Structure 1
Amino acid sequence: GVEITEGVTVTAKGNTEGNTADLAIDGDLSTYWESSNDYKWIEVDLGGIYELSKIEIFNKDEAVYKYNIYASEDGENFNKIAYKNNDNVSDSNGNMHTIDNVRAGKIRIDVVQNSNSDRVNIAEINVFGKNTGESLPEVKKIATSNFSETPWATEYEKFNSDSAYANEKTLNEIKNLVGRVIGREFKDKFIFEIRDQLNGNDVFEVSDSGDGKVLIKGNNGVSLASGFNYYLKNYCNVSYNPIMGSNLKMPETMPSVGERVVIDTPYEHRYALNFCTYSYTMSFWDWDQYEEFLDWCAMNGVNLVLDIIGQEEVLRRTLNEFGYSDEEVKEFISGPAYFAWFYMQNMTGFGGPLPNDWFEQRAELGRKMHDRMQSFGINPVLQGYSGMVPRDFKEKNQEAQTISQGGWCGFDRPDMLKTYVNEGEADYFQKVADVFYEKQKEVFGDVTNFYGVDPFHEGGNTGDLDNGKIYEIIQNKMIEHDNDAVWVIQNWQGNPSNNKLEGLTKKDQAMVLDLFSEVSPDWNRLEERDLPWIWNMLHNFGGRMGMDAAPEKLATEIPKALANSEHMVGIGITPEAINTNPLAYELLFDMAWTRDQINFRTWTEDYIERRYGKTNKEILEAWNIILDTAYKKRNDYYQGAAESIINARPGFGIKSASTWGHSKIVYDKSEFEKAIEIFAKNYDEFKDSDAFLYDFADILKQLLANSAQEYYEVMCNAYNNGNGEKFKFVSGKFLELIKLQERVLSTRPEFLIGNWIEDARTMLKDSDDWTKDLFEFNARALVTTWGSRNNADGGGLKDYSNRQWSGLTEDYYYARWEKWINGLQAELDGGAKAPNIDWFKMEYDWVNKKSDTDKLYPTEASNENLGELAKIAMESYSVTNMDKIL
């Protein structure tokens, strides 16, 4: 005591009809606030700062509720003070929570579970405490620096105007790169020189200096870093990949080059990144991870990179001009795990609101990146504007003309401004486009001529408008703000249609990314229309894991496309996540530096020697097996690596884990297992190579995914034939298999759920508990249910981003399979028929758990012996010995 009965108000960001926020604080148990969307929290202002001692919560019924309570004494930071996570039903007595005399002027109550409904509620909330006599300070307004006002602008302009400074900056940066990649001790073993292009092409040179140093030339930063990489790979037997395992062990003396090499690339651009990568992979990256990635990029020839960092600040400044407060902008924009589909105009709000801190920190990160990109000569692809507005845009701008875009996977798509209007109508596409392109300049300055925008990505509605005219107007508007602009357009499943593309009146100033060239190429239509285009390897969908690559097609189809075209201006990668199969990515970027087809088999032979730091007859034999099975050329249509049954929602007749995925293994399983047998045999000798360990884990987890599929088919039979004892046995072996798999995945830092989650919670500095918890929600949601019920179930996104990860496997995948198996066992044993399992309910239970109150997942890999784990896999859980195993 005492109860705070006066001066208290409340807000929410959604409610069902008649069940408003104020009903949570009206003294009446019969009236309640109820959620209508994914904002399941209310915010109570107490009319002053109180030292709280008790908080009391009533719900509308006797369901089981779970919620977290946060408080703020400064109006900015909301920190967790209480929570209910027990399985006790609500009742007429309410729930009483003791607070450790915490100072608070505001409270947030986030109800994350209701056993009875998707919708949550608070019938009453009573707060008890002692009045401090103080009031909350004013909340600082979001303010960011203008680019021209920062040291970043001075540096950017200096590099631009002063050739000697620019060259000195580039050359120092490439030396810094060497020291980051292989160690500071190797920096002074290199001499870097800028030279000209070779007949209009990017080019590098590597040769001996005459005093035991390596002299490397390049026309620019990425040419210089590519020469460095070339030297490492071809002379040092070193392989750098910061995301998927390296061999960075340098020779004792620096190897001599011998005959000087001069290597050019016929491609103007080497492209990297899908909008999706910024979500499935990069959601929670700090500068350290970005710097690392850019070093890998420059070393791999990359000079064109999609860039959406800090674009929330750009949109904020733009919408602020058209009737939106900062809070309204924050409700529009998604959370940090969803920017891919926000910027692709597919969804809004979900995972947010972002903290106020977000905007400055991210504008600064993007500025940091444009400085490094400028040094290397990497062109960022910034944002174009196509007409994306919130659904309430007309409400705030009555003369605006908009086209309703409908739903995408159960999310409301933003509206789209009519790209043109009738005479006598206000043209808000022109108004908003002008502001956007101006504000983007204000935030980042003039850093690129490349702008990406993709109207009608995976649906939408063109309304009454002409398709070609829409694309003419978007491009003309883009060129109005940058005369040299190039509109970078994604080509996905025949869209944009030929009619849309024929609307581009300046073909030179558009560039189409053929997104899926290694499985389903579609560049002929672009070539025929004289559109500049880029051949792209997609490879990875949703970050879904498994042994999968197309090295033969990369080694042959790329130079074949160069010979058979006149408008192929580059190659690149467009993966939805960068987390899988390093072979595919090294080969792809290697193919930029040849005009001739190469032998993928002998390419692989050399690749594995530098990756492992050594090779032998048996290891080569194992990789040829991988090339003959998992990496064998195929001519069908498929999206990503074949999915593991372990990761699928349990049921009968499963043929995938995700809606658009596949579980069909097109190679011989027993043959593939021979590769694991060879790796186990050579473990003790190759165990000093981390990349070897990485690859061993990759193929071994693939072995167990494959055999789980077969064991699942057997236990399905044992159930259908009514054999309860046989089902018990095979289902037991199935579960023991998953447990072995969890041990295998525990060995790699990159397979830990705990790193993904901790990165989310630590990505910004000085985050309150509210922000950490929300960002953990984003991390957990994306790799499981994706969205909430209507997104996961009706919308088809359930387990789209499924990961063969440690922690996630034990607590989520195993748990699903265990529950289904038990219900089937109970029925077989003469019990009641197996119940329907509301899978989403169980999954979203895991999604909403917090690292600080529930279970903290480790950030440290285990010491398990892959060689031994492989022997146990071969003996007890294989396809080869399946008949003996039973």
Structure 2
Amino acid sequence: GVEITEGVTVTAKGNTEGNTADLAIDGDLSTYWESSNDYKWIEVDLGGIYELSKIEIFNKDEAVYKYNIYASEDGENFNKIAYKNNDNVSDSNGNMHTIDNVRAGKIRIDVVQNSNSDRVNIAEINVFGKNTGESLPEVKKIATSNFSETPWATEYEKFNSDSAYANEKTLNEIKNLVGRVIGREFKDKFIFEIRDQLNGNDVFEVSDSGDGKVLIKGNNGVSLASGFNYYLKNYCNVSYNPIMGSNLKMPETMPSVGERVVIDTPYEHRYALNFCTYSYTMSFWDWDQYEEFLDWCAMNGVNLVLDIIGQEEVLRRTLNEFGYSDEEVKEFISGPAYFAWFYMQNMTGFGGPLPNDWFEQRAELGRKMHDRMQSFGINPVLQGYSGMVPRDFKEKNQEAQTISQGGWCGFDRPDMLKTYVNEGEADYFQKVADVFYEKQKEVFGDVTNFYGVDPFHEGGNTGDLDNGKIYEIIQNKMIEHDNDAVWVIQNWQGNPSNNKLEGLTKKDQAMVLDLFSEVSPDWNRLEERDLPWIWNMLHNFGGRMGMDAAPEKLATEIPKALANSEHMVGIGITPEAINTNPLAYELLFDMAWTRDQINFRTWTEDYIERRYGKTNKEILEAWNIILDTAYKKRNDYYQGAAESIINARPGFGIKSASTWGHSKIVYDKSEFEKAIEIFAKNYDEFKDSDAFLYDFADILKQLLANSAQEYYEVMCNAYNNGNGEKFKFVSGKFLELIKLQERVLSTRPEFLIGNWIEDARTMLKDSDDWTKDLFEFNARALVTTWGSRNNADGGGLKDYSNRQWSGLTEDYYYARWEKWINGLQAELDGGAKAPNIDWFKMEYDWVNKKSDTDKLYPTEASNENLGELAKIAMESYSVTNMDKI
């Protein structure tokens, strides 16, 4: 094990001025590399492959550093060979790590923590090993297939050109949906038929075949699956929701339909998904989860779906034509949990770089999905182009004209190409837009006419440019590459302004999603300008959880809008995550199949019976309590469910966990608790229904969140009044309340942080330790600090995506409240005034832990008895009995 003192080089992706990467290997403890951004790692090339025995690391000062060390012997796979995670200070002796004679040609050191500073540093790194005499192999450049080369193109064109082949494909796939949803044994109890549209509208039919089979007709795959769904819900008491709880118990014999049914929808489009859904929910989904979602979409009538899968390969091909290497593209693109804000032009780089094999795998996932969407008749919304480029685009393309977009929550927005230039100037918008659309075809082929792009989303800068001309040129360029193109435009807090929208010269080739129609509708100005538009329920913000829904508005306002408009072309959901309140989403898509207002109370009565497989007068009573409290119609502005005090940074006078959220419970808390009492009383009868268990946990965790808020206010008066003994008692019950909450959360697999993290770590096959640790960082950061310090704090993003999740509650939310409570108690006991707590440092310490070295979170839910937990909460942690407590 001889020290390697020749041929050693190093790179980094960032450094503060005069603290370059090479200063970590110059044999001088007085010079150091220091990080300047969130790339906190350096990569050492050893000038050959050595079997390493020791790695020695010196820091620039005496802080507590934590870091992870990776090695590669093939040039591609960097696996973890050592780490420091104890709390020892660095000193002048350095830290020496034993390596077990691991072959390595390259080494990565990632300094994730410095107790003294946001920035990390390495003064010296020495490596000890024996030469093997071998050199690393040249690593294969990124290669991806053109669509036309693949079997996907063959199958896609065959569907297009052969109506008989396509109908057989659609009918066979619908049969496969039946098998996946309710069981293979039910596939041959259904006969599916393509029919025509009913006077220009999508339509389905359900009826008896004559021999005890169910005959379902529909004009395309979505209508057929919606007919299948209609039959399950109205004749089988069955309810399908692969994300939020199902009752799939089929009768012993197929129920007969009786009088035939024909049902159509007046909406050309039924739309689903926010850009944000691709991050807060779908970041680590595999094909199995996409297939389920599409089965559920088709069954709920969905036929228009935002689709950004594999767009990284589209952008790689595009930027490669303008002076960007693959490595530079990977630095530009974000990590896997941040594509929502990368493609909305809000942020770059953070969470990356993506692995090299990312690009082909995701292009293949996208092609897989377009085949299934084609079978069903679901239109994807691919990408438009508006001028997004990296900030160094002019450095590489000197004649290009760009506009700096400034910051977004402490992130650097990408630049924007000037949408038009002067005569004599080069028009790189035309150049890059031409390539972008052409490369998108190369990756996926002609799969849709709908394209989504949103310049100046939540900021940016229009420079000297005219707002209307900008939108005129973007649309014209889109139509140039697809004559039937429809630009799908988000409508969010009054933007894009009327002046922007009036620049659209082809109104029929634009479609505006009114993003927030169930709380802050903004479609009148779209309707006035004869712009096709869609009525959308947003409902969910950041995946933040709680009992919250607007069923009365859905049942009334949607048909009212259709009766008072001419350019309402559909309805949709725009949730930032799909993880809460399945009633809201079931009801929205149901409103596609009526032109009249419906009764939301009686609809809910039918819904819960098929959701639980059974019903009675007590369960119905509890849900009418829910309808009169958490789901009651309101007329204020609010973003998502009222937040749980448990999830907020501890402090005085807290009114929300997120920056733009709300913690006020607008219903009577003791009234709502009656729903929990009724669920507990009927637990033993309904416990065989997983959806009942799902909803029980939902209302019970809402109960403990509601009561915790009351205990916090008491806890706060005790301190402000100096009553130490009372504070100790109230805060003791508070922490005990959270402990009980953790047990409730533990019962649901949907609430386990271990599932979120494991999905991140396993979403690619044959990925190295480096990639797994980096993906886990994406998963941990998104639901806590969101970004690093300037994003969480100065940017306002801290706890934006806070989740009432198992494990995360124990190790994050409880830990914060415990540390704050201990500080206040010491002060009240005659100690020094409680220090200010740098919350972000503590939070980022959890963000950077790894599942394979620190603590592995479970993927299996517990067996705790919700009914029993409900009794404990009512007796010892409730609002009703709070004065006895």
Q: Please give the TM-score of this superposition, normalised by the length of structure 1.
A: 1.00
Deviation at 1:568, TM superposition (A): 0.2
Corresponding residue number in structure 2 for 1:351? 351
What is the SS of the residue equivalent to 1:884?
coil
Deviation at 1:42, TM superposition (A): 0.1
Aligned partners of 1:99, 1:614: CA distance in 2, in Å?
A: 61
Deviation at 1:513, TM superposition (A): 0.1
Aligned partners of 2:837, 2:778: CA distance in 1, in Å?
A: 24
| Deviation readout 1:171-216 (Å, 9 max, x if unpaired) | 0000000000000000000000000000000000000000000000
| Deviation readout 1:497-523 (Å, 9 max, x if unpaired) | 000000000000000000000000000
| Deviation readout 1:317-352 (Å, 9 max, x if unpaired) | 000000000000000000000000000000000000
Deviation at 1:612, TM superposition (A): 0.2
Deviation at 1:790, TM superposition (A): 0.1
What is the SS of the residue equivalent to 1:426?
coil
Aligned partners of 2:870, 2:237: CA distance in 1, in Å?
A: 28
What is the SS of the residue equivalent to 2:884?
helix
What is the SS of the residue equivalent to 1:55?
strand
What is the SS of the residue equivalent to 1:882?
coil
What is the SS of the residue equivalent to 2:471?
helix
Aligned partners of 2:182, 2:403: CA distance in 1, in Å?
A: 54
Corresponding residue number in structure 1 for 2:840? 840
Aligned partners of 2:652, 2:838: CA distance in 1, in Å?
A: 15
Corresponding residue number in structure 2 for 1:328? 328
| Deviation readout 1:721-749 (Å, 9 max, x if unpaired) | 00000000000000000000000000000
Deviation at 1:229, TM superposition (A): 0.2
What is the SS of the residue equivalent to 1:322?
coil
| Deviation readout 1:771-795 (Å, 9 max, x if unpaired) | 0000000000000000000000000
Aligned partners of 1:187, 1:873: CA distance in 2, in Å?
A: 45
Deviation at 1:700, TM superposition (A): 0.1
Corresponding residue number in structure 1 for 2:822? 822
| Deviation readout 1:785-821 (Å, 9 max, x if unpaired) | 0000000000000000000000000000000000000
| Deviation readout 1:646-701 (Å, 9 max, x if unpaired) | 00000000000000000000000000000000000000000000000000000000
Deviation at 1:620, TM superposition (A): 0.2
Aligned partners of 1:172, 1:834: CA distance in 2, in Å?
A: 67
Aligned partners of 1:365, 1:157: CA distance in 2, in Å?
A: 18
| Deviation readout 1:703-723 (Å, 9 max, x if unpaired) | 000000000000100000000
Aligned partners of 1:742, 1:361: CA distance in 2, in Å?
A: 37
Aligned partners of 1:140, 1:60: CA distance in 2, in Å?
A: 37
Aligned partners of 2:617, 2:661: CA distance in 1, in Å?
A: 36
Aligned partners of 1:4, 1:580: CA distance in 2, in Å?
A: 56
Deviation at 1:247, TM superposition (A): 0.1
Deviation at 1:433, TM superposition (A): 0.0
Deviation at 1:453, TM superposition (A): 0.1
Aligned partners of 1:768, 1:440: CA distance in 2, in Å?
A: 29
Corresponding residue number in structure 2 for 1:300? 300
| Deviation readout 1:807-853 (Å, 9 max, x if unpaired) | 00000000000000000000000001000000000000000000000
Aligned partners of 1:629, 1:286: CA distance in 2, in Å?
A: 37
| Deviation readout 1:22-77 (Å, 9 max, x if unpaired) | 00000000000000000000000000000000000000000000000000000000
Aligned partners of 1:762, 1:314: CA distance in 2, in Å?
A: 24
What is the SS of the residue equivalent to 2:784?
coil
Deviation at 1:78, TM superposition (A): 0.2
Deviation at 1:88, TM superposition (A): 0.1
| Deviation readout 1:530-557 (Å, 9 max, x if unpaired) | 0000000000000000000000000000
Aligned partners of 2:811, 2:414: CA distance in 1, in Å?
A: 35
Aligned partners of 2:456, 2:218: CA distance in 1, in Å?
A: 40
Deviation at 1:308, TM superposition (A): 0.1
| Deviation readout 1:587-643 (Å, 9 max, x if unpaired) | 000000000000000000000000000000000000000000000000000000000
Deviation at 1:266, TM superposition (A): 0.1
What is the SS of the residue equivalent to 1:883?
coil
Deviation at 1:866, TM superposition (A): 0.1
Aligned partners of 1:75, 1:347: CA distance in 2, in Å?
A: 29
- 4+ runs deviating over 3 angstroms: none
Aligned 1:113-124 pairs, distance under 5 A? 113-124=113-124
Deviation at 1:313, TM superposition (A): 0.1
Aligned partners of 2:697, 2:492: CA distance in 1, in Å?
A: 33
Aligned partners of 1:130, 1:377: CA distance in 2, in Å?
A: 61
| Deviation readout 1:859-879 (Å, 9 max, x if unpaired) | 000000000000000000000
Aligned partners of 1:806, 1:122: CA distance in 2, in Å?
A: 36
| Deviation readout 1:564-592 (Å, 9 max, x if unpaired) | 00000000000000000000000000000
What is the SS of the residue equivalent to 1:106?
strand
Aligned partners of 1:592, 1:549: CA distance in 2, in Å?
A: 18
Aligned partners of 1:715, 1:859: CA distance in 2, in Å?
A: 34
Corresponding residue number in structure 2 for 1:706? 706
Aligned partners of 1:676, 1:576: CA distance in 2, in Å?
A: 28
Aligned partners of 1:810, 1:876: CA distance in 2, in Å?
A: 20
Structure 1 position 20 matched with structure 2 position 23: no
Deviation at 1:265, TM superposition (A): 0.1
What is the SS of the residue equivalent to 1:5?
coil
Aligned partners of 2:752, 2:661: CA distance in 1, in Å?
A: 23
| Deviation readout 1:244-266 (Å, 9 max, x if unpaired) | 00000001100000000000000
Aligned partners of 1:289, 1:113: CA distance in 2, in Å?
A: 35
| Deviation readout 1:244-292 (Å, 9 max, x if unpaired) | 0000000110000000000000000000000000000000000000000
Percent identical across equivalent pairs? 100
| Deviation readout 1:96-140 (Å, 9 max, x if unpaired) | 000010000000000000000000000000000000000000010
| Deviation readout 1:368-411 (Å, 9 max, x if unpaired) | 00000000000000000000000000000000000000000000
- C-alpha RMSD over aligned residues: 0.2
What is the SS of the residue equivalent to 1:347?
coil
Aligned partners of 2:100, 2:545: CA distance in 1, in Å?
A: 46
Aligned partners of 2:303, 2:351: CA distance in 1, in Å?
A: 32
What is the SS of the residue equivalent to 1:536?
strand
Aligned partners of 1:137, 1:226: CA distance in 2, in Å?
A: 54
Aligned partners of 2:143, 2:721: CA distance in 1, in Å?
A: 68
Corresponding residue number in structure 2 for 1:520? 520
What is the SS of the residue equivalent to 1:102?
strand
Aligned partners of 1:751, 1:277: CA distance in 2, in Å?
A: 17
Deviation at 1:355, TM superposition (A): 0.2
Structure 1 position 624 matched with structure 2 position 624: yes
What is the SS of the residue equivalent to 1:165?
helix
Structure 1 position 736 matched with structure 2 position 736: yes
Aligned partners of 1:91, 1:240: CA distance in 2, in Å?
A: 60
Aligned partners of 2:385, 2:721: CA distance in 1, in Å?
A: 60
What is the SS of the residue equivalent to 2:129?
strand
Aligned partners of 1:213, 1:53: CA distance in 2, in Å?
A: 71
Deviation at 1:430, TM superposition (A): 0.1
Aligned partners of 2:667, 2:570: CA distance in 1, in Å?
A: 32
Aligned partners of 2:815, 2:421: CA distance in 1, in Å?
A: 55
Aligned partners of 1:344, 1:582: CA distance in 2, in Å?
A: 27
What is the SS of the residue equivalent to 1:125?
strand
Corresponding residue number in structure 2 for 1:751? 751
| Deviation readout 1:446-485 (Å, 9 max, x if unpaired) | 0000000000000000000000000000000000000000
